[PDB]
Amino acid sequence: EEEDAGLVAEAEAVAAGWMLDFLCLSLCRAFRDGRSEDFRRTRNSAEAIIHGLSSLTACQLRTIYICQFLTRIAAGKTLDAQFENDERITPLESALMIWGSIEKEHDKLHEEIQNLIKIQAIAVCMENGNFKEAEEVFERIFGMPFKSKLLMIISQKDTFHSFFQHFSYNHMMEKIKSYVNYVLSEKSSTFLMKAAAKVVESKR
Amino acid sequence: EEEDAGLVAEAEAVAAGWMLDFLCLSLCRAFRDGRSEDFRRTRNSAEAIIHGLSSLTACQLRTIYICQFLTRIAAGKTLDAQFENDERITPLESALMIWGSIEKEHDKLHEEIQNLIKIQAIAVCMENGNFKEAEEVFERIFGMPFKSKLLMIISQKDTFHSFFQHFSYNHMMEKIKSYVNYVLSEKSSTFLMKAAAKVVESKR
Ligand SMILES: O=C(NC1CC1)c1cnn2cccnc12
Ligand SMILES: O=C(NC1CC1)c1cnn2cccnc12
């Protein structure tokens, strides 16, 4: 029966939406906690569920973008990882593209995270001795004072410059964890986590 | 806080249990319907969720066994697929091992499915011209009248024997779909599908 098959596919789409929100919340918490292996396994589950979803609401696209952004940040030092069809794009460059695409308020924290990802996208290339790649990442990102300081550091091959210690990788991760905390607060009330929490609490 | 972290991990285990039952029901329905691509994508989601689950109840192990059994049956003609650490084990042999391990009633249908998988495990080797592999699968499976008919067909290299048309691959799939229908009936009332169905119905 067409009608029965249709009702079941509609229910599978509702359940997939619920699973996506739950996995995003689980992924945010593993990122905030630094649970590296749980983040890897959760990322695998979220990716698979996303492939079983076709039509997306604006809320679901934002949820997917957040999962993809955290995945790229977690792989920010893995210059061998190719997240885009254009193989030249580094993981932090991919994270920056998603950050600029999310339907979200452009507050002070948004811009601080944005600039820290720009500095570290160059820094990670320098730390690996990839000086020509650093200058190419520089050209793609900036395509005045902040910009000229970076170009001077690149041309001098000053990998461990003191500038990269004031706007360090750890500083970028901490600012991102601050944003993650707000997403965790926002998604802690979604259906599947709320129902699971009520079951656990009922057994206490 | 230890207590907070613990409560969250307990809720993640509850939600993963709910997702496992839902994905098993979705996988059974794709198998019954012959929706090949939906089965592949659902299998990917179920596998990922299973890796995020540690402790399993007897009910959860049975659910996982059913997913694995259907995956092996769907790949029954893919002799290049290695489902076990011992690389000699074919997909239908792997399906037979799981079938004999599930905590389930050994009714007439159970034995009919069992014998049809045994015949087809040999038949699929013969159809690919792998006559020596067919005799090795025969030795592992039977390790009297049914047994002697099979050995004669193998030694004669009678790939398209009429015996394999009375106990055909399609006959095995139809008997398995009959069992799948009972699993679909049994899992249609699980939490996540029930909740998603109620939402869809509320919008009608
Ligand atoms: O963006 C990714 N994942 C986000 C949606 C959860 C993603 C990119 N590569 N990859 C490989 C395995 C698993 N997930 C990934
Ligand atoms: O047994 C398997 N899946 C069942 C649990 C759902 C299984 C075996 N290989 N494989 C590859 C990709 C995805 N799932 C698989």
Distance CA B118, CA B141 (A): 7
Q: Is A90 on the interface with B (CB under 8 A)?
A: no
Residue B203 falls inside a structural domain = no
Q: Which residues of A touch B200 (CB under 8 A)?
A: 7, 10-11, 14
Task: State the DSSP H helix or E strand holding residue A12, giving kind and residue range, or none if neither.
Answer: helix A2-33
Question: A10 touching B, CB under 8 A?
Answer: yes
Technique used by the depositors: X-ray
The answer to whether residue B83 sits within a structural domain is yes
Q: How many domains does chain A have?
A: 1
| Facing residue for A52 by CB, picked from B8, B41, B191 | B41
A1 close to A20: Cβ distance less than 8 angstroms: no
Helix (H) or strand (E) holding B60: helix B58-74
Distance CA B167, CA B119 (A): 7
Q: Which residues on B lie below 8 Å from A19 (Cβ)?
A: 19, 22
**3-class secondary structure, A142:** coil
**CA pair distance B105, B120, nearest whole angstrom:** 23
Minimum-distance CB partner of A11 among B15, B18, B193: B193
Side-chain-side CA neighbours of B43 within 13 Å: the count stands at 19
How many angstroms away from the CA of A23 is the closest CA of chain B?
A: 9
Query: Which H or E run contains A166?
Result: helix A163-166
- Contact between B65 and B25 under an 8 Å Cβ cutoff? The reply is no
Kindly give the interhelix angle for B91-99 and B108-127, rounded to the nearest 10 degrees: 170
Closest CA to A163 of A144, A174, A148: A148
User: Which tokens sit at A54?
Assistant: 């076709």
Distance A71 CA to ligand 1 centre (A): 6
Contact between residue B83 and residue B99 where contact means Cβ atoms under 8 Å apart: no
Long-range contacts of A2-6 (CB under 8 A, 24+ apart): A5/B33
Question: In B, which residues are within 8 Å of A48 by CB distance?
Answer: 41, 44-45, 47-48
The interface residues of chain B toward chain A in range 127-146, judged by CB-CB distance below 8 A, are none
3-state helix vs strand vs coil in chain A, percent to 5: 75, 0, 25
Residue A32, chain B, CB below 8 Å: the answer is no
Pocket test for ligand 1, best of A24, A43, A56 (most atoms within 8 A of CB): A43
What span, in angstroms and rounded, lies between the C-alpha atoms of A123 and A121? 6
As for chain B, the residues directly before each break of C–N over 2.5 Å are 143
Q: By CB neighbour count within 10 A (0-12 exposed, 13-18 middle, 19+ buried), where does A80 fall? A: exposed
Report CB contact under 8 Å: A26, B45: no
How many CB atoms lie under 10 A from the CB of residue A178?
13
| Inside any domain, residue B20 | yes
Select from B8, B10, B196 the Cβ nearest to the Cβ of A14: B196
Residue A85: Cβ-neighbour burial (10 angstroms; 0-12, 13-18, 19+): exposed
Name residue B78's amino acid. T
Examine residue B66 and state whether it is found in any structural domain, yes or no.
yes
Q: d(Cα B143, Cα B141) in Å, to the nearest integer?
A: 5
Angle subtended by helix axes B131-141 and B145-155, to nearest 10: 160
**CATH no. for residue A94?**
1.25.40.210
Place of tokens 């993809």: A68
Least Cα distance to A180 among A18, A24, A17, A2 occurs for A24
Q: Residues enclosing ligand 1, CB less than 6 A?
A: A 43-44, 46-47, 50, 67-68, 71, 83
Residues within 8 A of B (CB atoms), A 182-201 only? 191-193, 195-197, 199-201
* Tokens 């299973």, located at residue: B50
Return the axis-axis angle of helices B145-155 and B108-127, rounded to nearest 10°: 10
In a domain, B103, yes or no: yes
> Is there a domain that residue B89 lies in?
yes
Report yes or no: B35 at the A interface, CB cutoff 8 Å.
no
CB atoms within 10 A of CB A66: 22
Looking at the complex, report in whole angstroms how far the Cα of residue A113 sits from the nearest Cα belonging to chain B.
27
Mutate to test the interface with B, among A12, A27, A35, A189 (most CBs of B within 10 A): A12
Say whether B11 and A42 touch across the interface (CB within 8 A). no
Residue showing tokens 């592992």: B140
Q: How many CA atoms lie within 13 A of A28 on its CB side?
A: 24
End-to-end CA distance of chain A: 45
Are the C-beta atoms of residues B95 and B73 closer than 8 Å to each other? yes
The answer to whether the Cα torsion of A94, A100, A101, A105 is positive or negative is positive
Residue bearing tokens 């599930």: B102
Angle of helix B191-202 relative to helix A191-202, nearest 10 degrees?
130
Which of A8, A20, A31, A202 best tests the B interface by mutation, with the highest count of B CBs <10 A? A8
Inter-residue contact B14 to B182 (CB < 8 Å): no
Residue A203 lies in a domain: no
In angstroms, the CA B106 to CA A131 distance is 68
Cβ–Cβ < 8 Å for A177, A31: yes
Task: Using CB atoms, pick whichever of A18, A48, A191 lies closest to residue B45.
Answer: A48
Determine the structural domain holding residue B174 and report its residue range. Answer: 2-197
Between helices B91-99 and B131-141, what is the axis angle to 10°? 10
In a domain, A186, yes or no: yes
CA-CA distance, A120 to A172, in Å (whole number)?
8
| Residue A91 token pair | 């993981």
Query: Contact A27/A70 with Cβ under 8 angstroms?
Result: yes
Cα gap B81→B40, rounded to integer Å? 14
DSSP calls for B110-177: HHHHHHHHHHHHHHHHHHTT-HHHHHHHHHHHT--HHHHHHHHHHHTT-TT-THHHHS-HHHHHHHHH
SS3 annotation, A58-90: HHHHHHHHHHHHHHHHHCCCCCCCCCCCCCCCC
Q: What is the Cα–Cα distance from A186 to A182, expressed in whole angstroms?
A: 6
